[PDB]
């Protein structure tokens, strides 16, 4: 197999997340020409560029398959962070859990409140 | 076990002296 160095993978990592745009997920050919806009990166030799252009096809494939570690998709940063912001059916998380034994009732009896008339329901 | 093979060597030296001290007197 082939395993590349940190800088080679990190350049590819920078190229796929910090400038995602639309590098190809499953196709090598667009990736072959989409990594040479000059501003996006400058490195000599086609094969050296091709080393980044190899991992990019797996990294974008990984992002398409699922979120990567520390996923930072430039095109799609607000993805399911809205779900953490989301609340469920009516946000009625509370009410009627109960599950209080006599000692659990004694804990509320120790403070001044006497919850549910000492009859949880 | 050098200590054992020194101590018992010393005892063999001590015994030699006893015969030498008495027989000679």
């Amino acid at each position: 197999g082939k395993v590349r160095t940190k800088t080679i993978k990190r350049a590819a990592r920078k190229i796929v997340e910090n400038n995602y745009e639309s590098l190809k997920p499953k196709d090598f050919q667009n990736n072959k020409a989409i990594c040479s806009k000059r501003n996006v990166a400058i490195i000599p030799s086609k094969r050296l560029r091709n080393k980044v252009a190899g991992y990019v096809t797996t990294l974008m494939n990984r992002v398409v398959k699922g979120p990567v570690h520390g996923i930072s998709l430039r095109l799609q940063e607000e993805e399911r962070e809205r779900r953490d912001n989301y609340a469920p059916k009516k946000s009625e998380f509370d009410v009627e859990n109960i599950t209080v034994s006599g000692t659990t009732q004694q804990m509320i009896d120790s403070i001044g409140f006497k919850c549910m008339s000492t009859s949880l329901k | 076990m050098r200590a054992k093979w020194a101590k018992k060597r010393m005892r063999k030296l001590k015994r030699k002296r006893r015969h030498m001290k008495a027989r000679s007197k």
Binding site: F93, D94, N97, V100, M107, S110, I111, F113 | -
Partner: protein, 197 residues
């Protein structure tokens, strides 16, 4: 003081339990152990403690300067809520060791005060604070190591519903001192958004 609707919230939101093991410094907060054996806490103690925590938070010169470090999965959802209403500069994720000492390190934050998500998952973070002179404030379980912790919040702490109530309670209590979020009224927020599915 205590409010019954919120008090019954803590009871129904897993803030009625702790670890079966106990420590002498958590005995007062603990009501006792019941037949079940998980130590059951005392509710008034929890509310009183959260007000005491609030007064230190208003005291800091920059409300942003407080840092809360969350190193546990459960803590993240509730920790996100702290930043939305309170201004504390969060310190999320694994601590990245030595940040307080390493000013050169990228995420280094000097928090005039500290806040720890779990007593036994921030072991580096309280020692790191001890190096940088930071007053240490934290959350504590029924059994916890209180080493390098000045005051802490009695709680179950091992389920995010309880963790959720704590950040909710603390946020509401500092805001009540600032006289902004409720003032003898309803908190716009609802108990959900304090757990991540």
């Amino acid at each position: 003081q205590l409010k019954e609707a919120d008090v019954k919230k803590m009871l129904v939101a897993t803030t009625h339990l702790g670890v079966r093991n106990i420590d002498r410094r958590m005995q007062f907060y603990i009501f006792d152990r019941q037949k079940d054996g998980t130590f059951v806490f005392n509710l008034q103690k929890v509310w009183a403690k959260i007000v005491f925590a609030a007064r230190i938070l208003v005291t800091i010169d920059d409300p942003a300067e407080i840092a809360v470090v969350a190193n546990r999965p459960d803590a993240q959802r509730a920790i996100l809520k702290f930043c939305k209403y309170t201004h504390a500069t969060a310190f999320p994720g694994r601590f990245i060791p030595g940040n307080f000492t390493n000013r050169m390190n990228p995420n280094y934050c000097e928090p005039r005060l500290l806040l720890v998500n779990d007593p036994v998952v921030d072991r580096q973070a309280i020692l790191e604070a001890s190096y940088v002179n930071i007053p240490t404030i934290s959350l504590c379980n029924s059994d916890a190591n209180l080493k390098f912790i000045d005051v802490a919040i009695p709680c179950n702490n091992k389920t995010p519903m309880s963790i959720g109530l704590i950040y909710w309670l603390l946020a509401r209590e500092v805001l009540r001192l600032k006289g902004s979020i409720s003032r003898t009224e309803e908190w716009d927020v609802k108990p959900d958004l304090f757990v991540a599915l």
